[PDB]
Amino acid sequence: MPTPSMEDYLERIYLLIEEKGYARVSDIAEALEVHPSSVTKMVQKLDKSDYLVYERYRGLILTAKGKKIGKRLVYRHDLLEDFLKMIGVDSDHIYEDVEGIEHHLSWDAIDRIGDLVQYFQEDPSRLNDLREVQKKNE
Amino acid sequence: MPTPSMEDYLERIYLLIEEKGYARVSDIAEALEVHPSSVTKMVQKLDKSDYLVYERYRGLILTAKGKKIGKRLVYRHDLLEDFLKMIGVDSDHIYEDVEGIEHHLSWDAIDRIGDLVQYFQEDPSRLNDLREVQKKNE
Ligand SMILES: [Mg+2]
Ligand SMILES: [Mn+2]
Ligand SMILES: [Mn+2]
């Protein structure tokens, strides 16, 4: 039911509190380089759906549901960056390829990439074999 | 330089040409599920910049440029489809996942995914190991 950009907002709020203990509307406007009225409108939609609350001095506060979604997206980003690093995507492309995947892949597929990432680490000689395949191509 | 929309046309045109020598406007409309008048507008755009030619009583044939692009696009769709099958995504999620991400991955990542698919092809017992990780992880 939440749009991808609603989820990205919860992820950003969780990481703002990780960085300094608070999430402000002004923080999000400055980072996205948008007008603060679009942020307060997004905050309003997230508030009405019970993902966050707002109190003027503490700022933006995640609910149990909002904090669960925000953490999940941080870890999705990690998992997919691990995947793309493992298979050899270069540093110029990996970031936009992670943002590309994470917005257009079902959660079933994300889970399967998580199994794959686990597969290459339970016996790391699998990863050396994969890199041999790349070198003999190269 | 070609837009996502052009890439979806060029890929379908290549498949039909691959099967039949020419791509008819009516088969393109059917496959992409758009109104024939949309195809015409795209056909006129792609004709004007030399991706294709319209031949009377035949349909569309790609130029060297359009065919090079269209062949690469079909390779991308087919490689991603194999990739998702291989890591076990539900057969109900596959076409829509592929149509999703295919416009959002660099060619660098497509090549590395190709290295990954080749890694599993060169010793298919690696697919059985991968399946054990997934059954265990559950
Ligand atoms: Mg992100
Ligand atoms: Mn496609
Ligand atoms: Mn597509």
Numbering used by the authors:
A (entry chain A), B (entry chain B): 1 to 138
Task: Copy text verbatim from the article accompanying this structure deposition.
The MntR homologue (BH2807, BhMntR) in Bacillus halodurans is a protein consisting of 139 amino acids, and has 78% sequence identity with MntR from B.subtilis (BsMntR). Each BhMntR subunit was composed of seven α-helices and two β-strands, which could be divided into an N-terminal Helix-Turn-Helix (HTH) DNA binding domain (domain1, residues 1–71) and a C-terminal dimerization domain (domain2, residues 72–139).
Mn2+-bound BhMntR crystals were obtained by soaking with 50 mM MnCl2 for one hour in apo crystals. The crystal structure of the Mn2+-bound form was determined at 2.5 Å resolution, and the binuclear manganese ions were clearly evident in the 2Fo-Fc map and omit maps, whereas a magnesium ion was observed in the other subunit. The two manganese ions were found at the interface between the HTH domain and the dimerization domain and formed a binuclear complex separated by 4.5 Å, labeled as the A and C sites (AC conformer). The binuclear manganese ions were liganded by six amino acid residues: Asp8 and Glu11 contributed by domain 1, and His 77, Glu99, Glu102, and His103 contributed by domain 2. The MnA ion was coordinated by seven atoms: Glu11 Oε1/Oε2, His77 Nδ1, Glu99 Oε2, Glu102 Oε1/Oε2, and Wat95 O. In addition, the His77 Nε2 made a hydrogen bond with Glu81 Oε1, while the His77 Nδ1 in the other subunit made a hydrogen bond with Glu81 Oε1 via a water molecule. The Mnc ion was coordinated by five atoms: Asp8 Oδ1, Glu99 Oε1, Glu102 Oε2, His103 Nε2, and Wat37 O, while the C site of BsMntR has octahedral coordination geometry. However, the other subunit contained a magnesium ion which was coordinated by the side chains of Glu99, Glu102, and two water molecules. The side chain of His77, which is strictly conserved in the MntR/IdeR family, had a different rotamer with a hydrogen bond via a water molecule to Glu81 and was also stabilized by π-π interaction with symmetry-related Tyr57. These interactions could block the proper rotamer of His77 to coordinate with MnA ion in this subunit. There were few structural differences between apo and Mn2+-bound dimeric forms, with a r.m.s.d. value of 0.49 Å for 276 Cα atoms.
